[PDB]
Amino acid sequence: QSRQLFLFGDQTADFVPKLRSLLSVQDSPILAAFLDQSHYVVRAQMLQSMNTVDHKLARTADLRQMVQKYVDGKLTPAFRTALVCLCQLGCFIREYEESGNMYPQPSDSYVLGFCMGSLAAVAVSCSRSLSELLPIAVQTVLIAFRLGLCALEM
Amino acid sequence: PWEQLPGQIPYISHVTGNVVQTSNYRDLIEVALSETLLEQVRLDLVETGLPRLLQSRQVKSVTIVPFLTRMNETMSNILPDSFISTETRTDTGRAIPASGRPGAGKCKLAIVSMSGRFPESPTTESFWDLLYKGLDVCKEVPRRRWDINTHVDPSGKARNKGATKWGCWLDFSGDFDPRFFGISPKEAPQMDPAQRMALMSTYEAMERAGLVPDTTPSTQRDRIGVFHGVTSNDWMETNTAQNIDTYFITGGNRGFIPGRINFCFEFAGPSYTNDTACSSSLAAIHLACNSLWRGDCDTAVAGGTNMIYTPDGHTGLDKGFFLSRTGNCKPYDDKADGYCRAEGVGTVFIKRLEDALADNDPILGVILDAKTNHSAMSESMTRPHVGAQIDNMTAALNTTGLHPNDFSYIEMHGTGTQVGDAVEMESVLSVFAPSETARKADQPLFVGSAKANVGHGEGVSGVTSLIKVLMMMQHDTIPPHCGIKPGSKINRNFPDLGARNVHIAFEPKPWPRTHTPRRVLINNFSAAGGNTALIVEDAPER
Amino acid sequence: QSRQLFLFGDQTADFVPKLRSLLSVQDSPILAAFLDQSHYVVRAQMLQSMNTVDHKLARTADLRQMVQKYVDGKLTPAFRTALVCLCQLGCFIREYEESGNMYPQPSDSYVLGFCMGSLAAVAVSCSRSLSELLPIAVQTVLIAFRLGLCALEMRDRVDGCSDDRGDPWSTIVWGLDPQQARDQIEVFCRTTNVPQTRRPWISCISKNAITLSGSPSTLRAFCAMPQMAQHRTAPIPICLPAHNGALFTQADITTILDTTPTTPWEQLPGQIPYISHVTGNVVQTSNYRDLIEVALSETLLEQVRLDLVETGLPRLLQSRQVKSVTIVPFLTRMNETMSNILPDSFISTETRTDTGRAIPASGRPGAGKCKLAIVSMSGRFPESPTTESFWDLLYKGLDVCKEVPRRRWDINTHVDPSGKARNKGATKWGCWLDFSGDFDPRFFGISPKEAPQMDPAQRMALMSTYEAMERAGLVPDTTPSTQRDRIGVFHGVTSNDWMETNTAQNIDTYFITGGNRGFIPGRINFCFEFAGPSYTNDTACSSSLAAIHLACNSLWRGDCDTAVAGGTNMIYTPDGHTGLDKGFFLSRTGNCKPYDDKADGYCRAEGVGTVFIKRLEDALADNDPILGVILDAKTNHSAMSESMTRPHVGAQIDNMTAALNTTGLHPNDFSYIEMHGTGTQVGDAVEMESVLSVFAPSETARKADQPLFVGSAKANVGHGEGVSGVTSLIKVLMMMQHDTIPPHCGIKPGSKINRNFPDLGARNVHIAFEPKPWPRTHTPRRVLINNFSAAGGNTALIVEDAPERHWPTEKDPRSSHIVALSAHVGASMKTNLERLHQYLLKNPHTDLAQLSYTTTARRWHYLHRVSVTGASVEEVTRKLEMAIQNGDGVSRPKSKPKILFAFTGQGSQYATMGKQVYDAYPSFREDLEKFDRLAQSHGFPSFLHVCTSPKGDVEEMAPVVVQLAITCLQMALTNLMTSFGIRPDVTVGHSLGEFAALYAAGVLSASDVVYLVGQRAELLQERCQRGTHAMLAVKATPEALSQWIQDHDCEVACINGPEDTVLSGTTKNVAEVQRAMTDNGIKCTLLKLPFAFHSAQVQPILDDFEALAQGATFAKPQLLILSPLLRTEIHEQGVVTPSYVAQHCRHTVDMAQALRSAREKGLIDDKTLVIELGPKPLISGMVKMTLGDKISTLPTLAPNKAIWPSLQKILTSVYTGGWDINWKKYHAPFASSQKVVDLPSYGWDLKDYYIP
């Protein structure tokens, strides 16, 4: 029988336009919650793992300001991993929150990710509905931000 | 439990090309990080193993059938080529029924009517007629208010001694209709003139929107709030000496402007007054917008007043050279020496766009964002900070999600100081026209301020500027800028404004209404350090 | 195959409790959206289909108010259909949004609804996910409201005289056959001559009972007659027609489905099979609109045949499961009351029944839908320069109303009739603050000349704001919520005395600027560098509470992360008394004296008040001391009154009800009401009936054993007219602090309550006369605060009790603790020292670790500084006393010192090296393990066993492991000092510490240091031979040893001091020199080494090592490097190269000359801190012998010692020098001590800036 393949890409992608698209959607409650909570968790995490001078340049109150400061070179390469994972998960969330389709199921779906696009694949594969995917995706965004900090240190 | 989240959909590895053994969330994130940091990504193995993975599965099933491919960044195009041996497809769709409009938040605010009083302009029509030809109405005090010849005296070391003579008062300040508002004609002279003009302007704005209380869900008397912005009250609570009664301080202290509007019109929603001295009205509009976004009200009456009935305020400012010994504000140029104080009234009615669309109301414009911050990290409160203003304008832009090239006009604060305007100009250029050959190619940006035409309102500046901007969209015309004389020149600190595609109108410019909305940025600053920024859009065609 | 059944009930259910439960859920976005949108659509629809009088009674702004007005009988029966459908759909949404289950699917689910419960069944069956179900459910709620309106219209069309007769239109009759009931109905109607439209009809036919519907008058007369007395009957409280095809028609349904077009009828097809409650069969699959029409047909036109449902279902799945695996259970998801009827046949003669529940976990609610935590407070009140004095005055129940003191001005002379002239007095009362001129301008960067021109309220607001910031342990730019650009100021002020009006002595540039009226919050913003929004409010007698409302609104919107809400009221100019005390509005007697049969007015009072507010999440994350929680703020206007001054009971009732609806609390959850208590004879009467109507409506009201107390701070301090809101909030917060309801002083023992409140006690509403115990328990204590103004505005604030978090008690591994004090001048240093000493004497049982945490991490550190270290509170107290006696920080600090990092050589290794820091700080452990992994990736063996294990000394250890262990330990120590905020100004390493110095200087990266050290050690091991050379430490100047070295072929290895030198050479030559200089009396120490660097033993590896060093990147030094090789300083890029590193390992270490040259060039003085990084202090002796005893050397580690004395000495020396420590990193790994202790307030350097 037919199947569906979900593919997630790596950091080489151009995510700023697509992310700017997500921040403008209007009738999606789960997407708005996802963006808010992802920013909250990353804001908490970035105080612990940043020095005082580097944190003051990158401090943001909202996700739109974070996306602004990224394109101005006021963030670090660690934020790129987090923002690409966040864009991929938000794109999935919007695609399935706007079409009203049945959530992907074990018997008719596969998931694949490339070169750090596998975090979003893991998060998506471990859910049964869009309501269960919200906390898992926020946690995955946190882990993707932590992956970028480990590589910056190395 | 490590299996708090088990795995449901099968997972394929990008370093092996096989299906990963089913596990829980934590055990699968660890596998992902191991593959990312410890292993080689073998795309050839992926390409060889993905076709074989399906072949071993669908063969046991009915047959091998197409494959919908859902992508997020790339690598689709490779798959249909490797798959044309069998099965492939792609995806798109947005097909659920519409809803009720975005709630109290995440929604735009519609300005449905306006009114006010401005120097030599007892209406908004006269105000536009004065803007159109680029007139300045800086003028001295007449005998009606107070005669300077009676103040002839040496250096004013005594009490109530003036040091400046300019000022743009309103000649039509005593006119009122007390019977319409259920007020005794004996009580009328004891009222503050600003209060009476605010009452009449509020009724006029209510008339212009066709608003009748208790006739629509959004116009129930308990859902209408009043948000006034006032900083200096002249002959409202202190001066009066000819007559005093019990109802003298009660009814007019300072909170009775919105309170009297609430009582006279029977508005039973929240009521506030703001003192942010030179951005009181725009900050009050911000508070009204916040109340509408929270849900505290369904309709807001945001306005502001500025009266100079007592000229005592002239002496205080004319000590550090802050005030001007010359004509009108004269914004940015190599001629600035100060600003001239002006009086005024201004009202706007604001709803949420949904309520104005349902009520068939005449939308004048749409508010997209209001932002306020403080230039606290400055050498002094008076000194403006370029970084703070840049941060405020950038915050507004980030919130609205618009590019700097979507804006065709900037309504500047144009304080009129020689250095004051310099800071705001570099802030504007840094935000909107950062460089030559910047994204400005064939989309000019014009700048100007109502402070060139009517003076500095010090509390009605925000409402005055908003009313001016709404009347530009009404008449589809960018008015000429009167700050620079034809024989003068731009300030040397702005050497190549034109090279950046930033112009200052000298004759009325056509500003046609098209399918693309026209966006404006309004700026207001105070010597107290507060900065407010308001983004106004074009109303839709319904 | 198993399957699920979803059941939906009818209007007979009890939905108010469940609906109230739904309105309180917090982490469900789709449910919140559903509730919002359903209310929006019904609000739109109810204006069209309601008359003007009936709409005004039922108008609501939110769903919580709708649910409130329903239970008050202010709605119509049409709203009950809508609300029941809404409750069913919301219950389904919550069940599937909290469990995270897969949405119901066509192949494993069925849906069934009863008697208008079929609308929700249709909506649920026409969806594939919860995102597609939201709009469909909102539309279904609209259709249910329209169905209710149609039924109401038909009820009025049959009985227009039944607007009041909403009596049961239905009843249940047991043991009556349908045919017998039909015949009896026919006979009764024929005999009594009842019009055809009023005949009874059977609505439901169950197996045991039938339901009879009709007009109440005819229905009761039919049942209340013989031939039906035997049957037991009950009435159904529904009062609408339905299930009558002789009254309704398809045209009614067509009218219902009028405002519901979707372009394709199959815009929403059906997915889950649908079962009819009038047939018991599966309805043929259709689209949404065709299925809603079927539902309405069944509801309004057909008999609900429950008997056929019982037989229909078993047969339906019996023919289904049979083709499936076998007969399998039936999970039943129910919404109302039919779950247990099903098993009667579903457990035997059929399959089974079940139920379940589940949930995942997430994070707290966002900026909205979240509570606001009050983290600190401060203020000034009459006779109470602190909040402690204010409480001490509240507890004893005193009134401080008094006349103006004679010190300022005498009232006797001003005695005059009506003040037609200038400066004429007419009043004498008023509660001023005696302590109004005191200020500390230097703390705020204000000239003492400027201070007298400031408004006293502004200065007191500045000091109170700093005190409140201190009490919360708030340091700007240290947490996400305390970034300077996320802090706003919301002040409420109505009357400004001698701030903008009276100033006449002199006029300057700083007259209008700085003090107009908006400069209170503006000056706070500037002085504290708060760069968020700033507002001032004038709402005269509710300015402070309305400003708190504005601050709460900003926090709920997201404009700020921290809010500074306060208010002031000053009467510094009493000239305004005469105007107000004309119509008897003011009082010619004592204090406010709230409600009683003696009230005559109120007395004006001054005050200041500040509170710091965050969102509860941010205060929980910051470990802040939460005082209380704000749940709701509400504001409205009493505009529909005879006058603004006159209070309106309806408006106040509406405001309090709005607050209660928003919070979702019952009136019985409130144990105290803080009333406005204006003090007027009639003014208080209106507020009392409002309070009773809201909270204690009647005798035997829900008040049974839960008393309600009332009172007001206006009885104790007077009427603040702008600080009343903050004053009342501070009083209420200080009541929760001391667990006591204070006595009420309004009524004297010999007086009596006002006769308008005759039976307050009978309602369980009391007024405390003695302090009442108010214990803190597991149930939070809720308070309502009221504020009104003569302008007509009413504000209401609901304050809760803070939760109990965890406070993770656990012993601190540290043996000693640091206690830090600081001040901007010397007088404040002495004051703060004395205050902390007295506090510790008064509280000898305080936690020392938490005291250190509070004094260091949660404070800002000023110029003058003092430090103390002790093992217990008593030792700390003694040391504080000694510091007071000597006057430690009273003298101006003087310039800061330079910091020199010295790195030890390779003779300092020992087992269990730096294991104490490895066990104390996870960051140090992580760094050391990172370096150990880094070396292994370079091809070297792991060295971590050297620093942890206690086994093996030199036998199993090669040079590479020990050298790398020393070097990586030094690099980790450098990282740890850098985390604490210690920045070296210059570095120097002896022999193997040169590499660590280069790493600290920015020349080399960690990998380059590891690579060079390991490659050098490996080359040494491979080529050279062990045990050929030896070193000799000699107590003689190197010049004096020229002859002995030029004849025995030795060499100078190191020059460690003016008279300390180390010589190297072959064993035989070393022994010969030792003998020769022992015969000459010189004292020499012989050292046996396996490899001797800086000797001829390392010649062979010189060329090989220089080639390997080409691969390392030598960057520009970031700080000065002292070079013992060049005997000079390095400050350029090209000096350190592979040629430098090759010579370093072969030539002599002239540490003495490097230090001397650094001293001569002025780069290091005697007042510089030499921090010695390494396993053992050896360069400390070198520095002492070379430079002198006036230079402070601070070791880090030692073989047999505790780290804490040494680490704390380093931190204390750096801190007292004037540098800033990252105290949060020093306390980070000890969560037990991370709690704020309530220490004294700042020792302000107060002076009287009173202007004559």
Swiss-Prot record, chain C:
Presence of the UniProt keyword Glycosyltransferase in the record: no
Details of cofactor binding: Binds 1 phosphopantetheine covalently.
Reactions accelerated catalytically: hexanoyl-[ACP] + 7 malonyl-CoA + 6 H(+) = noranthrone + holo-[ACP] + 7 CO2 + 7 CoA + 2 H2O
Induction: Actively expressed at 27 degrees Celsius but not at all at a temperature higher than 35 degrees Celsius. Expression is repressed by curcumin.
Region (Malonyl-CoA:ACP transacylase (MAT) domain): 893-1214
Pathway the protein acts in: Mycotoxin biosynthesis; aflatoxin biosynthesis
EC number of the protein: 2.3.1.221
Keywords, sorted A to Z: Acyltransferase, Multifunctional enzyme, Phosphopantetheine, Phosphoprotein, Transferase
Residue positions of the active site: C541 (for beta-ketoacyl synthase activity), H676 (for beta-ketoacyl synthase activity), H719 (for beta-ketoacyl synthase activity), S991 (for acyl/malonyl transferase activity)
Enzyme's top EC category: transferase
GO molecular function, one term: fatty acid synthase activity
Designated name of the protein: Norsolorinic acid synthase
Disruption phenotype: Impairs the production of norsolorinic acid, as well as of the four major forms of aflatoxin: AFB1, AFB2, AFG1 and AFG2.
Lineage: superkingdom: Eukaryota
Any one GO BP annotation for this protein: fatty acid biosynthetic process
Protein's organism: Aspergillus parasiticus (strain ATCC 56775 / NRRL 5862 / SRRC 143 / SU-1)
Ketosynthase family 3 (KS3) domain span: 369-801
Free-text comment on this protein's domains from its UniProt entry: The domain architecture includes starter unit:ACP transacylase (SAT), beta-ketoacyl synthase (KS), malonyl-CoA:ACP transacylase (MAT), product template (PT), acyl-carrier domain (ACP), and thioesterase/Claisen cyclase (TE/CLC) domains. The SAT domain receives a C6-fatty acid starter unit and transfers it onto the ACP for chain elongation. The KS accepts the hexanoyl-ACP unit and subsequent malonate extender units are loaded onto the ACP from the MAT domain for chain extension to generate the linear poly-beta-keto ACP-bound intermediate.
Cofactor: pantetheine 4'-phosphate
Starter unit:ACP transacylase (SAT) domain, as annotated region: 1-372
Function recorded in the entry: Norsolorinic acid synthase; part of the gene cluster that mediates the biosynthesis of aflatoxins, a group of polyketide-derived furanocoumarins, and part of the most toxic and carcinogenic compounds among the known mycotoxins. The four major aflatoxins produced by A.parasiticus are aflatoxin B1 (AFB1), aflatoxin B2 (AFB2), aflatoxin G1 (AFG1) and aflatoxin G2 (AFG2).
Keyword Transport in annotation: no
